[PDB]
């Protein structure tokens, strides 16, 4: 559970926002990309796994699950690549909800930034610091720290 | 101490590698950029502060310390922007040493990747996971977790 992440892809302004969610905490990382390709997804996963202890990734769709470039990155980074089938149906709702929340924050900050990528990183910041009371950022650190001990 | 980061800029293949070091743990994040500008530095800091609780940043040079775009990002993200003068002279040696280590890892992986940015993220991965015994990744989580409690 401390090492399980979920990929999520959403769209805004004719562009693609790729998101990784740490399932146990709700903590996220995200990037703007021109289009979701195996190559973009592979590079993003490499970045994530160098920064947090990523054991398992639930991929966001069958194309990324199939992609040989994505498999190569998961192999390289020691990641178990799994499908993202919501056997638990609440998953879909949680993801949907998070996408709406992120787009809302992006809209709230959009005019403070000339470029979309900046607004998206502002949204990552606000989401991870938001007190719900602990924040997502505090929960991920606590979960992993307990696990290390 | 749990919130103190140091910026570091090094060069390779006619390009610039921008690095942020968590001082207490040795944990890093890094990116390849065409040139070190206020704009690139500001965007990088925003990304970092959305991902880890960045309280203080020791900037890597006077230009980034002076840059209004960098000051705007530090303001936005709640970061105390400080100079990076090594009042403790061991700092210079630690930074120099880390840059050599990173370039060595990059050389060891360089042929596994078509692009430099990929090799640099491979190096971030290897550096943060390297058991020295705890890893840098384990130390940063433990330091911040203790602080939260
Ligand atoms: N000898 C030259 C042959 C190089 C290709 C070999 C090969 O498949 N490497 C994988 C291994 C590996 C492992 C993890 C992540 C990326 C990669 C690389 C692929 C790759 C994918 C996406 C990218 C890339 C590159 C890149 O190749 O940099 O660049 C920016 O987005
Ligand atoms: N639309 C009217 C607003 C005009 C921008 C106002 C303004 O200075 N915002 C700062 C606030 C702020 C706060 C933190 C980080 C960036 C920024 C932004 C600057 C900026 C810097 C670097 C970048 C950027 C942009 C960007 O502007 O996206 O994009 C990629 O690297």
From TrEMBL, chains A, B:
Domain Integrase catalytic span(s) in chain numbering: 1-144
Listed cofactors: Mg(2+)
GO cellular component terms, A-Z: host cell; host cell cytoplasm; host cell nucleus; host cell plasma membrane; viral nucleocapsid
Keywords: Aspartyl protease, Capsid protein, DNA integration, DNA recombination, DNA-binding, DNA-directed DNA polymerase, Endonuclease, Eukaryotic host gene expression shutoff by virus, Eukaryotic host translation shutoff by virus, Host cell membrane, Host cytoplasm, Host gene expression shutoff by virus, Host membrane, Host nucleus, Host-virus interaction, Hydrolase, Lipid-binding, Lipoprotein, Magnesium, Membrane, Metal-binding, Multifunctional enzyme, Myristate, Nuclease, Nucleotidyltransferase, Phosphoprotein, Protease, Repeat, RNA-binding, RNA-directed DNA polymerase, Transferase, Viral genome integration, Viral nucleoprotein, Viral penetration into host nucleus, Viral release from host cell, Virion, Virion maturation, Virus entry into host cell, Zinc, Zinc-finger
Signal sequence, renumbered to the chain: none
GO BP terms in the entry: DNA integration; DNA recombination; establishment of integrated proviral latency; proteolysis; symbiont entry into host cell; symbiont-mediated suppression of host gene expression; viral genome integration into host DNA; viral penetration into host nucleus
Highest taxon above the source species: Viruses
Natural source organism: Human immunodeficiency virus type 1 (HIV-1)
Name by which UniProt lists this protein: Gag-Pol polyprotein
GO molecular function, one term: exoribonuclease H activity
Protein's cellular compartments: Host cell membrane; Host cytoplasm; Host nucleus; Virion
Topology term for the membrane: Lipid-anchor
Predominant location: host cell
Membrane-spanning ranges: none
Reactions performed catalytically: 3'-end directed exonucleolytic cleavage of viral RNA-DNA hybrid; Endohydrolysis of RNA in RNA/DNA hybrids. Three different cleavage modes: 1. sequence-specific internal cleavage of RNA. Human immunodeficiency virus type 1 and Moloney murine leukemia virus enzymes prefer to cleave the RNA strand one nucleotide away from the RNA-DNA junction. 2. RNA 5'-end directed cleavage 13-19 nucleotides from the RNA end. 3. DNA 3'-end directed cleavage 15-20 nucleotides away from the primer terminus
Portion of the full-length sequence here: 57 to 209 of 288
